[model samples]
Target: SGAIYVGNYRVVNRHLATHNDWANLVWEDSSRDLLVSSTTAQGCDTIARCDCQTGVYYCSSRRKHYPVSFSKPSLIFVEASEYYPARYQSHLMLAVGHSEPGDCGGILRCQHGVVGIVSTGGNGLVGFADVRDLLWLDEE
Candidate 1:
């Protein structure tokens, strides 16, 4: 029961020792899906999909499951909100730390999964990646 909207933000992953490591959109609309097109530092370009209504995430290039890390333009969630890799990071109180916005309580991290809580603001602060939102913006 909080503000849910996508924030057009780009940040560095403190643990990754990388800059502009990730970018993402937090969704709230129950009728739309999250579509992201991003590239990594090593020249790895990818277009991924995350479901705001449900915790469903998939990489168009790799299908169901693949072993890839987030680099440039990656669609990582803020924190451990969803199904991000939990075995290679720590908890920090920075701007965003890879946990759900709801879990961080005071930060903005990008994650791998579409589930979990990315912002402390919960559904209210999360953004919806639905077609309607696109229509509103693109006039589609």
Candidate 2:
């Protein structure tokens, strides 16, 4: 298979080329950038742009990377797991709300779950291709 492009950048899979290896893809170059978009339950259109800049760099869903209003959202807790590692581990978790004041009506429900690394210079949830269900912890 060829490389996958998320925008102006190429997405690289970090894992070895094995028959069972998956979910290890990453954006290695700082020059690589991507735009992610999703709609909230309140009918709000949310967009998130991510890149490599030490941490899991992200920006506005409706704007460019400059003057980035992004935040390295914290991980409160995770009661989930994944299947690729073969060790029964979790690859996805919740990301704290990063929506700025006046954005998304100051609603925490704008926050979404991210799959993969949860540290500086890791991976961010790019899409929800195989996502089965989306749960909201509380009523919004």
Candidate 3:
């Protein structure tokens, strides 16, 4: 019953309702699969599944066994509105930096997993990092 499409990719998950947001995407090291987003239901985390080879995913949460099938198959992450982990992390770090020490809020964009912190309004690029170069995980 639960089925939706994010850009060109389709997602089939029961817990994927209005209450859930696109959390994170993770790759499966043991298999050729991808976790589209980590959703939360009943204060628990659940993931939407996708097959890398067939481009067919099945969401097995809340007794919902819906399968997502692409038009042809062989899908790409960019086409599916997938963002790199560093991008999310950068945003999180900036969020933490905003309340604790000072007002650190801006637009965080990641290019090929490299995080670039930009200003909020129309300033410019303030900082950049790969993972933990300097601007990301700095003690100062």
Error of 3 at 10 (Å): 25
Ranking according to TM-score, highest score first: 2, 1, 3
RMSD of 1: 14.8
* Model 3 lDDT tens row, 55-123: 111122222221222221222121111212212222112111111101111112222221221111112
Compute the lDDT of residue 1 as modeled in candidate 3: 27
Q: Give the C-alpha miss distance for residue 129 in model 3, angstroms.
A: 29
* Per-residue lDDT of candidate 1, residues 1-140 (tens digit): 11112223222222221222224322222112122222322221111233222223222222332222222222324434353332222121112112233232111122422222122113323322222223222111
As a TM-score, model 3 comes out at 0.16
For all predicted structures, in order, the TM-scores are 0.17, 0.18, 0.16
lDDT value, candidate 3, whole model: 0.21
Q: How well does candidate 2 match the true structure in TM-score terms? A: 0.18
- Of candidates 3 and 1, the better by lDDT: 1
Q: What would the per-residue lDDT of candidate 2 be over residues 107-132, giving only the tens digit for each residue?
A: 11122322122211113322111111
The lDDT for every candidate, in the order shown, is: 0.24, 0.22, 0.21
Clashes, model 3: 0
